[PDB]
Amino acid sequence: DYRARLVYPFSGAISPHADIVDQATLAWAAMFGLLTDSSRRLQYGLLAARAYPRADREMLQIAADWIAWLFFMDDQCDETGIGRDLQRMIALHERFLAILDGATPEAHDCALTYALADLRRRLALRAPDNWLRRFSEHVRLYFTANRWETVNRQRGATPNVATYCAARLFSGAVYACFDLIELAEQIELPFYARHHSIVQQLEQAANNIICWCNDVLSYPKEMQHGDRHNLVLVIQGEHQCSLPEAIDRALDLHAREVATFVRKRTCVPYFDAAVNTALEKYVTGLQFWICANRDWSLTATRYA
Amino acid sequence: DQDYRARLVYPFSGAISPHADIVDQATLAWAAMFGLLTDSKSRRLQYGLLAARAYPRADREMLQIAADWIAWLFFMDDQCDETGIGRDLQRMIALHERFLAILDGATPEAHDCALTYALADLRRRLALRAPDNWLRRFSEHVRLYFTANRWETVNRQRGATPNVATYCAARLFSGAVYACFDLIELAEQIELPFYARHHSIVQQLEQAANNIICWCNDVLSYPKEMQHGDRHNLVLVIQGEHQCSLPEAIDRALDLHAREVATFVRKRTCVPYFDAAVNTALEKYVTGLQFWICANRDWSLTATRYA
Numbered sequence: 001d002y003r004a005r006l007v008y009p010f011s012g013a014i015s016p017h018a019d020i021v022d023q024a025t026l027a028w029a030a031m032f033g034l035l036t037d038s039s040r041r042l043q044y045g046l047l048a049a050r051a052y053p054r055a056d057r058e059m060l061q062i063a064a065d066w067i068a069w070l071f072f073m074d075d076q077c078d079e080t081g082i083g084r085d086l087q088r089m090i091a092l093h094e095r096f097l098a099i100l101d102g103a104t105p106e107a108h109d110c111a112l113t114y115a116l117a118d119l120r121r122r123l124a125l126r127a128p129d130n131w132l133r134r135f136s137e138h139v140r141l142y143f144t145a146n147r148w149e150t151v152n153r154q155r156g157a158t159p160n161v162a163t164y165c166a167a168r169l170f171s172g173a174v175y176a177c178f179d180l181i182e183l184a185e186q187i188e189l190p191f192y193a194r195h196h197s198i199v200q201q202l203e204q205a206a207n208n209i210i211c212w213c214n215d216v217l218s219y220p221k222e223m224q225h226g227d228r229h230n231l232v233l234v235i236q237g238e239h240q241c242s243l244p245e246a247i248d249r250a251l252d253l254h255a256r257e258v259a260t261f262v263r264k265r266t267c268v269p270y271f272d273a274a275v276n277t278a279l280e281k282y283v284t285g286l287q288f289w290i291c292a293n294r295d296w297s298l299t300a301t302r303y304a
Numbered sequence: 305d306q307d308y309r310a311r312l313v314y315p316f317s318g319a320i321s322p323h324a325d326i327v328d329q330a331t332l333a334w335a336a337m338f339g340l341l342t343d344s345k346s347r348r349l350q351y352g353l354l355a356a357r358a359y360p361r362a363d364r365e366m367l368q369i370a371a372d373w374i375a376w377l378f379f380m381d382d383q384c385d386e387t388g389i390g391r392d393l394q395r396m397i398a399l400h401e402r403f404l405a406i407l408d409g410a411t412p413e414a415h416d417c418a419l420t421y422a423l424a425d426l427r428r429r430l431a432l433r434a435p436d437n438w439l440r441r442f443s444e445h446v447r448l449y450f451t452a453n454r455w456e457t458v459n460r461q462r463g464a465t466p467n468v469a470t471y472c473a474a475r476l477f478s479g480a481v482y483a484c485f486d487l488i489e490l491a492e493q494i495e496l497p498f499y500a501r502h503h504s505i506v507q508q509l510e511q512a513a514n515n516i517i518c519w520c521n522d523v524l525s526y527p528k529e530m531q532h533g534d535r536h537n538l539v540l541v542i543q544g545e546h547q548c549s550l551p552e553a554i555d556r557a558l559d560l561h562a563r564e565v566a567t568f569v570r571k572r573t574c575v576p577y578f579d580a581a582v583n584t585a586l587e588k589y590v591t592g593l594q595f596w597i598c599a600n601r602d603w604s605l606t607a608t609r610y611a
């Protein structure tokens with residue numbers, strides 16, 4: 001059993017609002033008409049609960065509804081035709097990007113555009129102008145990464161390990177989720193601290209772990225759809241090796257990346273007591289996400 | 305004197321655009337038209353000759369925007385560093401609300417000042433040469449530059465001095481170097497994919513190049529910044545933290561500069577192979593960072609600003 005190797009030298013936590021938030025995410029998905037096929041156990045609110053465990057219910061609900069939105073958007077890209085049609089996806093992302101800027105939805109817009117607009121409207125009530133910009137960009141880059149994956153599928157091109165790993169950092173909107181840690185913990189990190197190279201390298205490390213963990217768990221389902229945007233499948237193509245060896249290599253990178261994150265957590269320079277207090281809350285927020293992603297995915301029927 | 309020149313060397317060469325002089329004369333004409341020129345050596349500014357060195361392969365239309373942009377930063381910085389607005393957070397937030405609005409595409413009004421009109425002209429001209437995604441990335445780096453200037457204003461107003469770690473982290477934005485680095489894409493006419501543009505090794509090369517440029521400037525600009533009682537300078541910050549002599553601080557400042565050049569060269573060889581086309585485009589961008597490192601050094605020793 002190779003899944004037992006997805007381990008960390010730290011533990012996670014879950015919000016006491018977990019179930020109340022998850023049932024509210026289902027009501028939210030139903031309201032904006034995101035529920036279509038079949039849908040008893042999605043439990044997208046139970047991932048948010050683990051990801052932002054100290055968050056007040058109102059903020060955790062936005063995060064939960066946001067995580068839900070991403071899963072609905074991802075399933076469309078990876079298991080339907082739009083993920084092989086760039087023209088359709090460009091037309092869709094033009095509407096999303098307009099909604100991110102604060103444009104009101106119109107009669108011709110789809111359910112996902114309406115849903116994103118509500119999340120943007122709600123984030124606007126709880127986040128300052130400077131935060132929305134940083135969120136917009138990370139989400140804008142998330143769309144760009146999906147258009148890139150769409151082109152690869154449409155042109156039948158598989159990227160090398162170097163290219164995939166670089167693109168995979170944006171293709172999961174992990175940086176956009178890490179932004180919500182600021183609102184969840186209610187911290188105002190100053191520009192110099194927020195964008196410091198060590199914080200970036202901690203974010204990059206945390207992002208890789210989360211994504212490479214998911215790649216090990218979701219390779220079977222992505223393989224059946226012929227979607228090779230997966231560390232295991234990209235490694236297999238590059239090294240022309242067996243699937244067990246490809247999994248073994250992916251887990252070696254995961255293990256090495258956990259070590260890097262732990263090593264680099266101690267390399268944060270001292271700015272002042274107040275700023276460093278806020279940073280450890282954010283860096284704790286990263287660790288919560290690392291665990292939240294692994295804890296949920298092993299129990300979730302999605303990778304069964 | 306020679307001790308400085310031997311420690312401000314780089315293992316790579318710079319270059320200058322053949323359009324240098326007409327671009328500089330046009331920048332002086334542009335500045336005068338928008339009323340950015342103060343009554344006082346107006347021909348001995350040469351803001352165009354920095355741009356020419358910074359973006360040497362750029363077409364004349366593109367280089368001119370960059371030259372007018374560099375001129376704009378210089379006029380703006382002199383306000384924050386050598387006038388009363390840099391000791392008043394209230395007036396600066398009011399001004400910075402107008403700039404950020406102009407960057408979002410807002411038309412200037414009657415009550416707006418010269419710099420607001422000048423920035424609106426640059427955004428309009430950049431909108432004709434750069435796509436939507438580029439303008440966003442430029443706006444952010446310029447927005448963070450404004451925030452960094454507001455943070456210095458607070459430090460001056462309270463009479464507080466940051467430690468080496470705080471200054472070095474904040475100095476990366478106070479220069480608007482990332483905003484200047486964005487123009488390399490338009491200058492070299494390259495389309496770097498998201499994954500290559502925002503890659504960690506590329507980010508490390510940028511902040512390495514940013515540190516070299518800013519720490520080089522600090523070594524040459526501590527005399528005139530000391531006169532205004534401003535300790536936003538690696539030399540003066542190291543002196544404050546260590547409580548050492550001014551020669552010792554300069555030595556420590558040039559040590560960091562020297563090791564950062566060594567880092568940049570080491571990081572340059574660590575860029576992974578994506579594909580022929582992307583690596584070629586990225587090769588042109590990283591060369592652009594080397595041109596900027598030399599441009600800042602070559603110009604500042606040449607210029608009258610630091611004398």
Ligand SMILES: CC(C)=CCC/C(C)=C/CC/C(C)=C/CSP(=O)(O)OP(=O)(O)O
Pocket residue numbers: 067070071074078171172173174177210211214215218293302
């Ligand atoms: C899915 C998504 C964009 C957001 C919600 C899921 C979250 C927040 C999990 C963290 C790891 C990420 C971002 C991978 C999902 S993309 P994938 O195509 O690998 O997803 P899959 O393996 O099908 O679950």
Ligand SMILES: CC(C)=CCC/C(C)=C/CC/C(C)=C/CSP(=O)(O)OP(=O)(O)O
Pocket residue numbers: 374377378379381385478479480481484517518521522525600609
């Ligand atoms: C004016 C400006 C922000 C940019 C022009 C110079 C450029 C583009 C080079 C990169 C390093 C910078 C910007 C430092 C000057 S800020 P400072 O207050 O230290 O300025 P000074 O040293 O007095 O020239």
Ligand SMILES: [Mg+2]
Pocket residue numbers: 074077078171
């Ligand atoms: Mg996907």
Ligand SMILES: [Mg+2]
Pocket residue numbers: 074075078
């Ligand atoms: Mg998927």
Ligand SMILES: [Mg+2]
Pocket residue numbers: 214215218219222230
């Ligand atoms: Mg997956």
Ligand SMILES: [Mg+2]
Pocket residue numbers: 381384385478
């Ligand atoms: Mg300054």
Ligand SMILES: [Mg+2]
Pocket residue numbers: 381382385
């Ligand atoms: Mg100055």
Ligand SMILES: [Mg+2]
Pocket residue numbers: 521522525526529537
């Ligand atoms: Mg200086």
